[PDB]
């Protein structure tokens, strides 16, 4: 069983590089963010452009959805995050306190909290309702590349150019684990596995790693793609076969068998670095997005 992703749609609209693409939890919407300071909403199934969300003064590097699919959060170079109501497009809150670009962001399953990672080397935790910063965590000693809450939002994982992945107790802000090899290339991305037992870490040594954080053991590695320059999103695809999906610096989307580490498909079509990929919650659908020479989002679909 290898997947057979075939190109359904090419989604044109962003005037600069696309930075991040995410599927709404209900699976009906695709949100995109871009260097053009814009968020755009697209139909997940027909690729129909829905709306443009604007307000940020500078480019956006990440966008995330609330559990109920009603809210988005964005992380911009203008040093802020904005909470948007998706149906009105209106900015509900502006989240002030980072002293440099906000790079990454995420809601917890509860969706009462936002986690943010910045070039100022901190991870912040914010209240959704009031927009106020609950905690500032001296998380790292270099730009924070990724922040992600576990299955129930009791933990946060952060990655950084400093070469570390760190696990944080959300409620208390206290660091529980630092993961470090005997060699520290920048960690360009991290997220929890759907079940919270593992973390998937990308490093700028063209390498993805599945870690048992609690024991500090690397269980799988995923290689063959190109990742030396950019903070590229990776995913666990769990709808059909059990895959790892990542963008790549060779204009390709890579798909690996989670257990064998075998490349099972490469998707061709983009004409620049695939910076971002997202896996549909229920359907075997992938969204991918590329950089400045491309600026498009592609939607793909497999049988498995």
């Amino acid at each position: 069983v290898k997947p057979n992703y075939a190109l359904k749609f090419t989604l044109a609209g962003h005037t600069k590089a696309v930075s991040s693409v995410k599927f709404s939890p209900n699976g009906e919407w695709l949100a995109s963010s871009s260097a053009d300071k814009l968020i755009k909403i697209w139909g997940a199934y027909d690729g129909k452009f829905e709306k443009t969300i604007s307000g940020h003064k500078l480019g956006i590097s990440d966008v995330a959805w609330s559990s109920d699919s009603n809210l988005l959060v964005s992380a911009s170079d203008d040093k802020t995050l904005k909470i948007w109501d998706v149906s009105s497009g209106k900015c509900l809150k502006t989240l002030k306190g980072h002293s440099n670009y906000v790079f990454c962001c995420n809601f917890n399953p509860q969706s009462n909290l936002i986690v943010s990672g910045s070039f100022d080397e901190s991870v912040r935790i914010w209240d959704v309702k009031t927009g106020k910063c609950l905690k500032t965590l001296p998380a790292h000693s270099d730009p924070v590349s990724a922040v992600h809450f576990n299955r129930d939002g009791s933990l946060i994982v952060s990655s950084s150019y400093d070469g570390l992945c760190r696990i944080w107790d959300t409620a208390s802000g206290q660091c529980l684990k630092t993961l470090i090899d005997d060699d520290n290339p920048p960690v360009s991305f991290v997220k929890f596995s759907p079940n919270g037992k593992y973390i998937l870490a990308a490093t700028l040594d063209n390498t993805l790693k599945l870690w048992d954080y609690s024991k500090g053991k690397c269980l799988k590695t995923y290689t063959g793609h190109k990742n030396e320059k950019y903070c590229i999103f990776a995913n666990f695809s769990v709808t059909g076969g059990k895959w790892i999906v990542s963008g790549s610096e060779d204009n390709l989307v890579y798909i690996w068998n989670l257990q064998t580490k075998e490349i099972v498909q490469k998707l061709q079509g983009h004409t620049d670095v695939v910076i971002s990929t997202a896996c549909h919650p229920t359907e075997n659908i992938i969204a991918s997005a590329a950089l400045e020479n491309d600026k498009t989002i592609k939607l793909w679909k497999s049988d498995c």
Binding site: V18, S20, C231
Partner: peptide
């Protein structure tokens, strides 16, 4: 920033 190295 993400879209630039």
């Amino acid at each position: 920033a993400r879209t630039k190295q």
